[PDB]
Amino acid sequence: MRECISIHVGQAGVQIGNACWELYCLEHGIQPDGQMPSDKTIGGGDDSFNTFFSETGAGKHVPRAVFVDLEPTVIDEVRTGTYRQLFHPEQLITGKEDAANNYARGHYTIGKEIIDLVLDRIRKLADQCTGLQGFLVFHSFGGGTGSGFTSLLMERLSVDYGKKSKLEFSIYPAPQVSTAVVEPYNSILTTHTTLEHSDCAFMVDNEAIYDICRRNLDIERPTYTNLNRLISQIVSSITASLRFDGALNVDLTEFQTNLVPYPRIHFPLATYAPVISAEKAYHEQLSVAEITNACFEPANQMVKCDPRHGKYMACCLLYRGDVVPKDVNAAIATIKTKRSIQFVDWCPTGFKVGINYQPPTVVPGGDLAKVQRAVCMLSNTTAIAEAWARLDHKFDLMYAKRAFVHWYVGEGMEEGEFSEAREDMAALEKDYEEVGVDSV
Amino acid sequence: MREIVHIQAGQCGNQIGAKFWEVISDEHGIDPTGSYHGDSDLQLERINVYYNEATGNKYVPRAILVDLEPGTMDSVRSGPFGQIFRPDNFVFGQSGAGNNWAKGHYTEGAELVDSVLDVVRKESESCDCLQGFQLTHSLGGGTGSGMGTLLISKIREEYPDRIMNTFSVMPSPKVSDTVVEPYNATLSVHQLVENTDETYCIDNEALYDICFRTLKLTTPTYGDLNHLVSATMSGVTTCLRFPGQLNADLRKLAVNMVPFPRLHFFMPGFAPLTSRGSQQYRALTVPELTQQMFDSKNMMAACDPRHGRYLTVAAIFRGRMSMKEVDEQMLNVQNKNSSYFVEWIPNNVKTAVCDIPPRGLKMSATFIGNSTAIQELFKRISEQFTAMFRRKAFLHWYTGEGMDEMEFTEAESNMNDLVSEYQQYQDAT
Amino acid sequence: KQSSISVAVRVRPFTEAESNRLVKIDNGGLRKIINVVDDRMLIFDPPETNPLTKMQRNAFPNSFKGSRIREHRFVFDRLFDEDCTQDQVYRNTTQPLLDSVLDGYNATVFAYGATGCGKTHTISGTPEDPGVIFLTMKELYNRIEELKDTKIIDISLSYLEIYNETIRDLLNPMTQCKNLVIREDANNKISVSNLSRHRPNSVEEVMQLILEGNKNRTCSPTEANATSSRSHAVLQINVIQKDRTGDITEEHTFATLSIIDLAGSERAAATKNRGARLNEGANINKSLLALGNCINALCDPRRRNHVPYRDSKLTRLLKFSLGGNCKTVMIVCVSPSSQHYDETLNTLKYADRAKEIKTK
Ligand SMILES: CC(=O)O[C@H]1C(=O)[C@@]2(C)[C@H]([C@H](OC(=O)c3ccccc3)[C@]3(O)C[C@H](OC(=O)[C@H](O)[C@@H](NC(=O)c4ccccc4)c4ccccc4)C(C)=C1C3(C)C)[C@]1(OC(C)=O)CO[C@@H]1C[C@@H]2O
Ligand SMILES: Nc1nc2c(ncn2[C@@H]2O[C@H](COP(=O)(O)OP(=O)(O)OP(=O)(O)O)[C@@H](O)[C@H]2O)c(=O)[nH]1
Ligand SMILES: Nc1ncnc2c1ncn2[C@@H]1O[C@H](COP(=O)(O)OP(=O)(O)NP(=O)(O)O)[C@@H](O)[C@H]1O
Ligand SMILES: Nc1nc2c(ncn2[C@@H]2O[C@H](COP(=O)(O)OP(=O)(O)O)[C@@H](O)[C@H]2O)c(=O)[nH]1
Ligand SMILES: [Mg+2]
Ligand SMILES: [Mg+2]
């Protein structure tokens, strides 16, 4: 089987998980109460849902999820809302205050009070899995919980499992928009766990998705629900190969083999090209060539970075719906003809291609329209380093005067660590400057 | 689960607390008798934050009333909501402080502090998890200021790792109902700077100005000012009690607002404030709340933020709204008024959002600023304090209660050091 | 220019039980992360591994798996390498202070270091190899004896400790912490109140007093060591002096020598016990941060407008014992074993914050 375990840390991760599990339940026909009516209607036994659900004897489906937060508010919302009966009752809350936006409180003092329960539940979920593929971790760099508890949890997972894949779907701080003063400290202190433990980290900033919603979907007042729905579409496109048949299936291991050239260069950028409103679903052909070209536009990137200021080291395209390989070949040839999309000289091939026959499913009340075709592009490029550099500058502006440092050192953290993580980030940036240089 | 123990000290603190409990009972649907007659489940989801359950389906607020004279206790008991409080929590003496800090801190308050702390311990040990404490009082007075500082110090000794807010009513330069306001205010600021995490400075002059200008009230009374302070207090702790897109407790605000351990004097404000016959002439949207919040006239502390620089800001919104609008508005405020924000903090504005607006309003927001202009208040107190201390105008009333002039000198030096520290982050660099 | 605050860093020598246990790999393990190049220049975590080329080629743009660089260049006002003994350490570090204390100005010594660093050896030592304190006070009593004529000198010893931002008199226990309050006299003297001031007549009496004070220090078990200390111990020697046969009058001149043994920084180390341990560690870390900020502000000419003395009791107590008038020296003791690797780096970083000498 092809099981994948999803972990949702913090408010951002939990709400992204709400969107993700809404999309999965609608994709597989599972009702919010866990009962799939196709078994009573058709008979069942000819469906593929083990990647995200487990069957009981009664016919109920339990998702393979671990909702964890250090406060009860968001998990209580999940436990009271529509999907109260879907998830297993074991959704972990610390019966205390949350991390309050600092890495130290969520890593050293409060995070170590519920770590054992989380690891025990993950052990129980992994024991039920016969063919476990990897982990999908959702959190936010800027949050206290999403940084500290994520670091602790990934340390424990690397110690225990090690060989299993771990994918990071994180929310990175934006260049200008922010919702906390101490975002740079939390994001910089998360460099170690997202560099040394994670195998492939997907980063997204709200500013880019806000711009996409404003321009593509024609929504002038978007909220976090739309952002979570887009991220859910991305994760669904990533994991579609494990769930449905296709002309060219691409699982997680093949994806990592094709996209990650060196062990440290594992921070690709994600893109969903054919995001359009129902009104603009007409007046557009949305053939494979147009969508593939739309993937490469710097405006459609979900991180505020310009790929034109860097070299595409690798790319993986994952198509869904009515797509033929020859159309994808023509699109890739058209892309390779272009001069503004520059590739490193040591990757002549460049493109990994996967195709799936299951088109995306539209959530009722959502923003995205019903489309015959879709594609998700995941590109390892050197431009992402710029998105880090801005953040580093912010960190310096706060660390010269040691602002807010007393809060961190008062929760079991040494002052020197602040420098060490920064140095690590700097080292990572240097690597992204050294891979892109042309060979002698 | 994030229980707050509320303490009221003095006449001003008791009145503000009575209005605050009226407002919170209205918010959660609690009647004066104590029974719940609401219409939404969410109101009961986090009733435990402020209330304790009681056998006959009752909700007794977790309030502790303190005073050194019984008149205000009788007034609160006879009030519309007086029956909701626990009779055992009414702690009071018989001889007042005489509007003297020494009586309330050393002689008369030291006798009642033991009983108050016994009730405080009894309330605290009933909490599943205690977020912290929440004191309301006025520094310009007698029993309120002295008892508040003494209880702050002793509770900090007993509960060093718990949040300690304080809604202290500063003395105004113009409005002055007492002659010895500077001594009490100085001796209280000397204690608050050492033993608190957040101190929401409030001034009667600013509340009166808000009532006269913003609300266009003809004859404002202490009820209206207490109403404003109640709206502020309810807005601060809104994310503890209701769900939202971005939650923010008291500790999160303490972490974000405070750059250095001594700069924890905040300037509060409430966003939607308009006359009775002028709501129909304005659309209630996020830009309107944003531009009213950062407006100088809306501050409740009698300071001009344009005379200093915002070290940090917090905006706690309530209502259904788009996060893009809030983020864009905060970013626009930061960029347009970049002179009034310190350069060595890339983002001075924290944002939190709640999904449940206050009854009646479609939207609302609460502003908690932290800016250098607050130092002006302390300077004004010094401008009076020295003027009364070189000649020792009313000193014998204080030294007759066991106090020494060394305490006055230490308090003055500490406040001057605080003013200098706030001034250090005003010059561009 | 001069920059009265000075940093001297001492490298501990390997113990016999260390070398044989660790040096096997060279012929845990003996990497010897610390390497002294010059009296103001050292290397932390150098590329001294002989079989390094085979992967140093990969460190270049060939294979990005070990491109991280931990080689740290550190510059300090004074250094003491493995073969340094105690006598010249005393000469270089605390001997000049004895002039200033007798000149009229105060003097201050800090002693910082992590666990297993040799701080106790440096400040106290052994009966056969006396530490810096014994040598300093013996020389002070000697210089009193030479200057006995034409000038009368009195010595007052006090010894307190700071713990959870509360003061405790080590030489007079069962005293409420609320009684020990820090003040500020009009003549720029701190003089914390209700301290049992002793008038020892010899260095042996001073050492006896130090021993009884250390007997009352606050320690706790269940850590990396079962006696690692949880508080900042401050020993103050007030040297009062006046002219014997000259201008015989009530006026006199007095100075203070402060010696501060600092508790090392804390990382909790997953102390499941936690409890007070967390509060103790948080207070220690906050006090260390406040002291570092004060020292950095003093060394920085731009931020001299305001120094955050009020942030902690330790900083407040030494308000007039760190500035330009007072001479400050800081003994940072570090161990060369990799077993304490990260800890040593943290200690070295705390030594670097005093003066950021980027121009090596
Ligand atoms: C017809 C209509 O729109 O009625 C409004 C109203 O006219 C206005 C002017 C209200 C009104 O407020 C005042 O006139 C006022 C007077 C003195 C001091 C402070 C306010 C109102 O009284 C206030 C009252 O507010 C509430 O109900 C909130 O829930 C408030 N609670 C209370 O005022 C309260 C009521 C009963 C018992 C205890 C408290 C609240 C605010 C923040 C946090 C929690 C609760 C409302 C809807 C109105 C009236 C009734 C006229 C305003 O109220 C607030 C505090 O937001 C003042 O400007 C706003 C905007 C409103 O438009
Ligand atoms: N895209 C997206 N981002 C979110 C969402 N919710 C919160 N965030 C981001 O999360 C950041 C704040 O950190 P949080 O993750 O909410 O903090 P936390 O994980 O709850 O941990 P605590 O600070 O202890 O509460 C903000 O900058 C938001 O941009 C969401 O629903 N969608
Ligand atoms: N300069 C030195 N010459 C010889 N031996 C030394 C020297 N410095 C330290 N040692 C020895 O190294 C060991 C560790 O030093 P020591 O002074 O005991 O640290 P410690 O105080 O026991 N650890 P801690 O209590 O956490 O500070 C002891 O056996 C010392 O005798
Ligand atoms: N907001 C408000 N302020 C008050 C009230 N009563 C007094 N004050 C202010 O508090 C000061 C007097 O303090 P007081 O309450 O008498 O102190 P106490 O006598 O020790 O309890 C005056 O300067 C007033 O400005 C009140 O009911 N509401
Ligand atoms: Mg949270
Ligand atoms: Mg020892």
Residue numbers in the entry:
A (entry chain A): 1 to 440
B (entry chain B): 1 to 429
C (entry chain K): 22 to 48, 100 to 432
Task: Tell me what the authors wrote about this structure, in their words.
Kinesin-8s are dual-activity motor proteins that can move processively on microtubules and depolymerize microtubule plus-ends, but their mechanism of combining these distinct activities remains unclear. The pathogenic yeast Candida albicans expresses a single kinesin-8 homolog, dubbed CaKip3, whose motor domain shares 60% sequence identity with that of S. cerevisiae Kip3. To understand the mechanistic basis for the dual-functionality of kinesin-8, we obtained seven cryo-EM structures of Candida albicans Kip3 bound to either the microtubule lattice or curved microtubule end mimics, and a microtubule-unbound CaKip3 X-ray structure. Our findings implicate loop-2 as a tubulin protofilament shape sensor that regulates conformational changes in the kinesin-8 motor domain, which can either induce curvature of protofilaments at the microtubule end, leading to microtubule depolymerization, or enable forward displacement of the neck linker for processive motility if the motor domain is bound to protofilaments in the microtubule lattice.
Using a longer CaKip3 construct containing the motor domain, neck-linker, and the first predicted coiled-coil-forming domain (CaKip3-MDC, residues 1–482), we obtained 2.6–3.3 Å cryo-electron microscopy (cryo-EM) structures of microtubule-bound CaKip3 in: (1) a nucleotide-free state, (2) an ATP-like state using the non-hydrolysable ATP analog AMP-PNP, and (3) an ADP-Pi-like transition state using ADP-AlFx. Unexpectedly, binding of ATP to the MT-CaKip3-MDC complex, as mimicked by AMP-PNP, fails to induce a “pro-motility” conformational change (i.e., nucleotide-binding pocket closure and neck-linker docking on the microtubule lattice) even though the CaKip3-MDC construct includes the full neck-linker. The cryo-EM map of the MT-CaKip3-MDC-ANP complex clearly shows that the nucleotide-binding pocket is open, and the neck-linker is undocked, similar to MT-CaKip3-MDC-APO (compare Fig. 1c, d). The cryo-EM maps of MT-CaKip3-MDC-APO and MT-CaKip3-MDC-ANP show that the section of loop-2 that precedes the β1c strand, which is not resolved in the X-ray structure, becomes ordered on the microtubule while CaKip3 is in the open conformation. This section interacts with helix-12 and a loop between helix-7 and the β7 strand of α-tubulin via residues Phe136, Ser139, Arg140, and one of the two visible conformations of the side chain of His144. For example, Arg140 is close enough to α-tubulin to hydrogen bond with Glu420 and Asp424 in helix-12. The fact that microtubule-bound CaKip3 showed more extensive loop-2-tubulin interactions in the open APO- and ANP-states compared to the closed AAF-state suggests that the interaction of loop-2 with the microtubule lattice restricts rotation of the minus subdomain of the motor domain. No equivalent loop-1 density is observed in the MT-CaKip3-MDC-APO or -ANP structures.
